[PDB]
Amino acid sequence: PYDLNALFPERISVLDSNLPLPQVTTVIDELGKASSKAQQLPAPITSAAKLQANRHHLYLLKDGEQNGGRGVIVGFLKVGYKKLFLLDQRGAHLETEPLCVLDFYVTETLQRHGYGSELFDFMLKHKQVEPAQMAYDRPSPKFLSFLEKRYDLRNSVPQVNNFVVFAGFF
Numbered sequence: 001p002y003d004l005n006a007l008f009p010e011r012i013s014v015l016d017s018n019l020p021l022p023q024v025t026t027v028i029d030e031l032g033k034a035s036s037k038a039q040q041l042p043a044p045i046t047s048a049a050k051l052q053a054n055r056h057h058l059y060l061l062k063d064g065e066q067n068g069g070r071g072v073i074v075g076f077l078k079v080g081y082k083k084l085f086l087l088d089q090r091g092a093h094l095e096t097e098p099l100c101v102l103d104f105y106v107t108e109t110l111q112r113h114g115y116g117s118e119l120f121d122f123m124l125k126h127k128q129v130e131p132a133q134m135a136y137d138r139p140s141p142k143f144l145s146f147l148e149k150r151y152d153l154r155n156s157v158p159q160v161n162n163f164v165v166f167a168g169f170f
């Protein structure tokens with residue numbers, strides 16, 4: 001119906017909770033399903049409806065050249081604040097409300113071409129945050145390698161919930 005380059009003129013677009021709407025819905029839903037399948041999750045953790053219902057922020061990377069220059073969304077990164085009880089390196093149990101990575105996916109055939117990096121760098125600047133100051137919801141092996149090799153985040157501080165944080169968090 002619309003070319004994506006017309007809906008999203010920027011290479012990386014930011015959506016809050018405000019999502020023409022049916023086309024935007026389809027794009028986000030398909031990407032969310034792809035991410036959850038990649039992670040062997042029982043259901044999508046990212047969808048258009050969930051975006052509308054939550055206070056999350058979704059970054060979408062568009063390859064403007066694809067589909068005869070009409071554009072295709074090739075990856076997304078979803079972040080949001082979560083209230084968390086966390087343990088520091090000495091075992092002090094601290095209440096915190098960090099910005100968290102909640103979902104993150106680049107189309108499998110397009111991985112390892114820097115798209116994840118572009119999304120993550122854009123978000124850090126946009127949110128005015130450094131990677132060590134964030135929490136990570138159940139990060140996968142691929143994402144942990146990404147964080148170690150590109151952002152020097154290694155040897156996380158063990159938590160009892162499913163969130164991961166690194167030394168510089170504290």
Ligand SMILES: CC(=O)SCCNC(=O)CCNC(=O)[C@H](O)C(C)(C)COP(=O)(O)OP(=O)(O)OC[C@H]1O[C@@H](n2cnc3c(N)ncnc32)[C@H](O)[C@@H]1OP(=O)(O)O
Pocket residue numbers: 035038039101102103104105106107110111112113114115116117118136137138139140141142143145146147149150
């Ligand atoms: C909290 C959560 O969101 S948990 C869910 C995380 N998402 C997933 O597991 C979904 C499946 N995985 C993905 O979609 C991707 O692997 C992502 C989004 C994590 C990374 O996106 P990509 O576009 O592939 O990352 P990008 O190309 O920018 O990689 C940057 C660096 O990260 C490291 N890296 C990325 N993938 C890997 C990997 N599979 N193995 C080892 N290192 C990797 C490399 O150092 C890479 O640089 P190099 O390619 O020059 O070696």
